[PDB]
Amino acid sequence: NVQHQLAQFQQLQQQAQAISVQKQTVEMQINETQKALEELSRAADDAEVYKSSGNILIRVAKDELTEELQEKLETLQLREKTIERQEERVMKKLQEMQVNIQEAMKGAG
Amino acid sequence: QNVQHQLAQFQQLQQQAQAISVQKQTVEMQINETQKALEELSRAADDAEVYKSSGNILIRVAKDELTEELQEKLETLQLREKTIERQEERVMKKLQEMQVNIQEAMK
Amino acid sequence: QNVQHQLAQFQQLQQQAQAISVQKQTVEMQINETQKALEELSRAADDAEVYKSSGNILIRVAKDELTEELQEKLETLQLREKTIERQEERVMKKLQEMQVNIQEAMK
Amino acid sequence: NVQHQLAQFQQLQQQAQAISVQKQTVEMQINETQKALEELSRAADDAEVYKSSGNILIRVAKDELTEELQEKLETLQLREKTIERQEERVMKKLQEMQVNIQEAMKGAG
Amino acid sequence: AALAEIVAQLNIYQSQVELIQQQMEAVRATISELEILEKTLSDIQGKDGSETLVPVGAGSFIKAELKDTSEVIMSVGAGVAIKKNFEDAMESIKSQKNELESTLQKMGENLRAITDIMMKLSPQAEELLAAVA
Amino acid sequence: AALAEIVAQLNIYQSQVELIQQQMEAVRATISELEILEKTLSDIQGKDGSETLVPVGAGSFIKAELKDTSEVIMSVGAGVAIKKNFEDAMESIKSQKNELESTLQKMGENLRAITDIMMKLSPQAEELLAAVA
């Protein structure tokens, strides 16, 4: 069926779109984490820092807080790289499946 | 009851079904935020400096007192979520029942 | 400059004229409220309990300190009102001048 | 001119409308003053009461504050009565001027 | 012919249903604020001397120590405010909530009638339409 | 004939002018809040121990005593807040206002261009209309 390949090709185009959105989201969380880490490093070593979790605000040691954001930053960056890698595969599988249709159409002969 | 009013109830029920779906998302959100706060609290020292949110102000409170309050809040919310799901099922049942009473009234 | 752009400036000026008229009403309002506060303060005793508004909170302050602050505020607002009226006249002048440059361009 | 009397009759109809609005406004201020005086009388004689004036809030003796609202209440009530009296005159002058037109129309003869 | 008469009034009703739905929200909004107010006053009882953080804008907070927590200055209209103790304050709040609830009960009825009469006019506008075409 | 092409795009532009006008307001709104924040922090300097009234809803206020007024806890994003002294705090606020002002300057340009090109398309849509009729 050639119409079954069009659908798969189209479902894959939406995935490419979805993944594109996840990437924009992760990038935003990276910028925000970076901005917070920059603020924390300019503050003195004994600055009083706080963490909000839901409806509560709690004072936390600055060195533990910094490490916590660093880990989140690093995990998000790895995630961004994993996303881009998935992105390329999808694009290749896409340009591919397009070819398989760009010729299966000239059906027989 | 004629099909016109039968259909009016069906759409009314769909209205209820959607409003309940909105409460369901809210309580789930509130449960997750409460469990997060409980998690962060478990890590802090007993003399930790913590403030709880109460409308326009934050009030400083001891970690143990806040832990008990958040535990109670979590339990009330989980019961609330259970109630919402039971109501959601009741409305779904009434929806299917009303659609059947409508299909058989159309012929 | 063709009549089309001439007319565009005229309407732009009318936009300015209206935004200025809105600032004028606001400052007048702010002046009246400040004079009222000054009036009420003059009646109170020197040790009166008074609070001044500062965004999300009210701050207790001595009557004399508050009287001087409100006096300065009143003077700054009255100068502001004077500035606004002078600008209003400038725009009115430009409006009439632009309408004349438009009537003579139409014939 | 009969058309000059129609205009005057119409200008007077709008005044009647305006006055009607002033009356609704004064009534509202009366209700609000009454509500505040009721609250003040239920509070104890040594209750701490405050007056807001613009951006400031000031503590004032309750007996002076009560007297101040009483005077405002009484002045507003007198105003309401003056308004209703003006209202009746306007209505009469209206039903009147209508007559002067309901016949000046049968112009001559 | 007389179809437009109906297709027209079902609007003055659809323009009044949405207005009441709006006014009912405002009322619900007010009730919400009163509920949050009740929680704050309850939350501070017995906390004289406890620290608090006051939001002052754009995510910023300043420090203060609660004082005379069993008392609250409440606005009663016409530029007047009265200091009241905890019980009296909670009592006024419940009275207002009740009043607003009652007002909500009443607004509900008004909306019903309107929705009801609309139901009896539509069956007519639908059969008149079938005639014109 | 090609009139609809113009009478149509002048909308995608009229639907983009109003969007920017909206976004510019939000920005002005944020700037306003930062200005009020600056006034409050200035107003409390040197007032440790002074009483304050905190609005808690529906016209009600509670009492508190200001504490460590030269310090303010400020939100820096990602769930983190940092306590800063007066000078540092005012410095961050001015930086943000400047940034938002700068952002406002830029949004202004974008709106200009759009309004400008619309001016050159209307003279055409008006003469095409004169042709069709």
Single out the residue of A58, F50, F23 nearest to residue B43, CA to CA: A58
Asked whether the beta carbons of F131 and F5 are under 8 A apart, the reply is: no
For tokens 């009330």, name the residue. B76
Q: Smallest CA–CA separation between C57 and chain F, in Å?
A: 5
Tokens linked to F34: 């930062």
The pairing of strands B57-61 and B50-54 is antiparallel
Spatial distance between the Cα atoms of C33 and E79, rounded to a whole number of angstroms:
13
Q: Which of residues 63-122 of E touch B (CB under 8 A)?
A: 66, 119
The alpha carbon of residue A8 is apart from the nearest alpha carbon of chain B, in Å, by: 32
Query: Which value, in Å, is the radius of gyration of the alpha carbons in chain D?
Result: 23
Residues in chain B: 107
**D74, D46, D78: which is closest to D62 by C-alpha?**
D46
**For chain F, what is the radius of gyration of the CA atoms?**
25
Rounded-to-5 percentages of helix, strand, coil across chain A: 75, 10, 15
The tokens describing E9, both together, are: 């009034």
For E18-32, give one letter per residue: b (16+ CB within 10 A) or e.
eeeeeebeeeeebee
Residue B65 burial class via C-beta count within 10 angstroms: exposed 0-12, middle 13-18, buried 19 and up: exposed
Please calculate the CA angle F55-F60-F66 and round it to the nearest 5 degrees.
40
Task: Give helix then strand counts, H and E, for chain A.
Answer: 2, 2
Contact E55 C56 (CB under 8 A): yes
DSSP designation for C44:
S
Question: Which residue blocks in chain E are alpha helix, DSSP H?
Answer: 3-44, 86-132
3-state secondary structure (DSSP) of residue A50: strand
What secondary structure, in 3-state letters, does D49-68 show? Answer: EEEEECCEEEEECHHHHHHH
How far apart, in whole angstroms, are the C-alpha atoms of residue D41 and residue F95? 52
Neighboring chain C residues of F125 at a CB cutoff of 8 Å: none
The letter for the amino acid at D7 is A
Q: Which uninterrupted H or E stretch holds E62?
A: strand E60-67
DSSP 8-state assignment for residue B55: T
Task: Give the CB-side neighbour count of residue F128, counting CA atoms within 13 A.
Answer: 12
* Six token digits for residue A88: 């390329």
Residues F13/F119, Cβ–Cβ less than 8 Å: no
Residue type, B47: D
Residue carrying the six token digits 């209209």: E77
User: Contacts of residue E36 in chain B, CB cutoff 8 Å?
Assistant: 55-56
Closest among E128, E77, E98 to E31, alpha carbons compared: E98
Identity (one letter) of the amino acid at D27? Answer: E
Write the CATH number for E111.
1.10.287.370
Counting Cα atoms < 13 Å in the Cβ hemisphere of E50 gives 20
Q: Could F75 and E89 be called an inter-chain contact, meaning their C-beta atoms sit closer than 8 Å?
A: no
Residues C8 and C23: their CA atoms lie apart, in Å, by 23
**F132–chain A Cβ distance below 8 A for any pair:** no
Provide the CATH topology of domain B1-107. Answer: Helix Hairpins (1.10.287)
Residue B61 per-residue DSSP state: E
Which residues of B fall below an 8 Å CB-CB distance to A? 33-34, 36-37, 39-41, 44, 48-53, 58, 66, 70
From the CB of residue C1, how many other CB atoms can be counted at a distance below 10 Å? 9
Q: Report d(CA C54, CA E81) in Å as an integer.
A: 18
Contact predicate F10/F118, CB 8 Å: yes
Task: Give yes or no for a contact between A96 and A13, defined as CB atoms under 8 angstroms apart.
Answer: no
Token pair listed for C44: 């109170």
The structure tokens listed for E123 are 């069956």
Residues of B in Cβ contact (< 8 Å) with F56: 55-57
Are the C-beta atoms of E67 and E50 separated by less than 8 Å?
Answer: no
Question: DSSP alpha helices (H): ranges in chain D?
Answer: 3-42, 62-104
Dist CA B59 CA F19 (whole Å) = 40
Count other C-beta atoms under 10 Å from residue B98's C-beta: 18
Place of tokens 């400059």: C1
Tokens of E30: 């007010």
The 3-state DSSP class for residue E61 equals strand
Output phi, psi for F71, to 5 deg.
Answer: -120, 145
Neighbouring C-beta atoms of residue A4, cutoff 10 Å: 8
Cα–Cα distance between F56 and E127 in angstroms, integer? 57
According to the entry, how was the structure determined? X-ray
Return the residues preceding each gap in chain E, C–N over 2.5 A, or none: none
Contact residues for B22 (Cβ-Cβ < 8 A; gap 6+): none
Per-residue b or e along F21-37, where b marks 16 or more CB atoms closer than 10 Å to that residue's CB: eeebeeeeebeeebeeb
CB atoms within 10 A of CB C97: 12
Count CA atoms within 13 Å of residue F77 on its CB side: 14
Q: How far apart are CA F10 and CA F14, in angstroms?
A: 6
CB atoms within 10 A of CB F64: 26
B54 and E54 within 8 Å at the Cβ level: the answer is no
Q: Which two structure tokens, joined as six digits, stand for D49?
A: 């009461």
Token pair for D97: 């001027």
Q: Cα–Cα distance between E74 and E91 in angstroms, integer?
A: 12
Residues A44/A46/A50/A51 CA torsion (nearest 10 deg): 80
Name the domain count of chain E. Answer: 1
At residue A4, what is the residue type? H
Could you tell me how many residues make up chain E? 133
Hey, where are the domains in chain B? 1-107
Whole-number Å distance between alpha carbons of C105 and C99:
10
Planar angle of CA F125, F127, F128, nearest 5 degrees:
65
Tell me how far apart the alpha carbons of residues B48 and B9 are, in angstroms, rounded to a whole number: 55
- Please give the Cα distance from E18 to D37 (Å, whole number): 37
User: To which residue do tokens 């209003």 refer?
Assistant: C88
Tell me how far apart the alpha carbons of residues D95 and D99 are, in angstroms, rounded to a whole number: 7
Q: At A58, which helix (H) or strand (E)?
A: strand A56-60
Please give the span between the terminal C-alpha atoms of chain F, in angstroms, as a whole number: 11
Q: Which domain holds residue F123?
A: 1-133
Regarding chains A and F, contact by 3 or more CB pairs under 8 A is answered as yes
Contact A56, B41 (CB under 8 A): yes
Question: From CA D76, how far away is CA D79, in angstroms rounded?
Answer: 5
Give the C-alpha separation, E67 to B62, whole Å.
18
Set of chain B residues whose Cβ sits within 8 Å of the Cβ of A60: 44
The CA distance from F32 to C52, in Å, is 19
**Euclidean distance between CA atoms F50 and F60, whole angstroms:** 19
Contact E64 F54 (CB under 8 A): yes
Both tokens assigned to E92? 């006024």
Distance CA C98, CA C14 (A): 11
Q: How far apart are CA C97 and CA C89, in angstroms?
A: 12
CATH topology of domain D1-109: Helix Hairpins (1.10.287)
Which candidate, D11, D30, D35, places its Cα nearest to that of D81?
Answer: D30
CB F93 within 8 A of CB C55: no
Contact between E54 and E66 (Cβ < 8 Å)? no
Query: Rounded to an integer, what distance in angstroms lies between the CA atom of residue E52 and that of residue B54?
Result: 10
Three-class secondary structure assignment of chain F: CCHHHHHHHHHHHHHHHHHHHHHHHHHHHHHHHHHHHHHHHHHHCCCCCCEEEEEEECCEEEEEEEECCCEEEEEEECCEEEEEEHHHHHHHHHHHHHHHHHHHHHHHHHHHHHHHHHHHHHHHHHHHHHHHC
Q: In the beta sheet, which residues pair with residue F55? A: F61
- Classified as helix, coil or strand, E56 is strand
Structural tokens at position D32: 């609000």
Torsion angle in degrees (nearest 10) through CA of C15, C21, C23, C28: 180
The residue written with tokens 């790289």 in the block is A81
Q: How far is CA D76 from the centre of its chain?
A: 7
User: Of D34, D90, D88, D89, whose CA–CA distance to D66 is shortest?
Assistant: D34
Nearest CA to F71 out of F59, F56, F86 is that of F86
Sequence-separated (6 or more) residues with CB below 8 Å from residue C90:
none
Cα separation values, C57 from B77, E15, F32, Å: 33, 40, 16
Q: Take residue F115 and report the two structure tokens written for it.
A: 């309004």
DSSP state of C102: H
Do E47 and B56 meet the contact criterion of CB atoms below 8 Å apart?
no
Q: Which two tokens stand for residue E126?
A: 């639908």
SS3 A51: strand
The H-assigned helical ranges of C44-103 are 63-103
Q: Is E50 helix (H, G, I), strand (E, B) or coil?
A: coil
